[PDB]
A paper describes a structure:
Here, we describe the structure and function of gp61.3 and show that gp61.3 inhibits the lysozyme activity of gp5 but not that of T4L. In 2002, we determined the crystal structure of gp5 that showed that gp5 consists of three domains: an N-terminal OB-fold (Oligonucleotide/Oligosaccharide-Binding fold, gp5OB-fold, residues 1–129), a lysozyme domain (gp5Lys, residues 174–339), and a needle-like C-terminal β-helical domain (gp5β, residues 389–575).
A 1.6 Å resolution crystal structure shows that gp61.3 is a fully α-helical globular protein. It contains 5 α-helices: helix 1 (26–34), helix 2 (37–55), helix 3 (57–70), helix 4 (73–75) and helix 5 (87–95) that are connected by short loop linkers. There are three gp61.3 monomers in the crystallographic asymmetric unit. In two of the three gp61.3 molecules contained in the crystallographic asymmetric unit, a calcium ion is coordinated by several water molecules and the main chain hydroxyl groups of residues Val94 and Glu97. The thiol groups of two cysteine residues Cys29 and Cys81 are close in space, but not close enough to form a proper disulfide bond. The distance between the sulfur peaks in the electron density is 2.43 ± 0.06Å when averaged over the three molecules contained in the asymmetric unit. As a global average of billions of molecules comprising the crystal, the crystallographic electron density most likely depicts a superposition of the conformation with a disulfide bond (which has a length of 2.05 Å) and a vast number of conformations in which the thiol groups are greater than the Van der Waals distance away from each other.
Numbering used by the authors: 23 to 97
């Protein structure tokens, strides 16, 4: 997804600050769309990191954030 202010914050704020909110944003989508996947997605975020989603979640006009679960659990 894209939002001008969220895009700028995600690219300028402290690394740990953005990383913590990315995880919370993903878990919120998991709770809404695949609530039983909470423990599994949490395990995948810890092993694979979340900062690789810095661009697609806040700066990408061509990424639908609903697809973040499939992105995380896929290879
Ligand atoms: Ca992965």
């Amino acid at each position: 997804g894209y939002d001008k202010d969220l895009c700028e914050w995600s690219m300028t704020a402290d690394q740990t600050e953005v990383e913590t909110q990315i995880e919370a944003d993903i878990m919120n989508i998991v709770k809404r769309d695949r609530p039983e996947m909470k423990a599994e997605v949490q395990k995948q975020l810890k092993s694979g990191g979340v900062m690789q989603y810095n661009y697609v979640l806040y700066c990408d006009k061509n990424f639908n954030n609903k697809n973040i679960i499939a992105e995380v659990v896929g290879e």
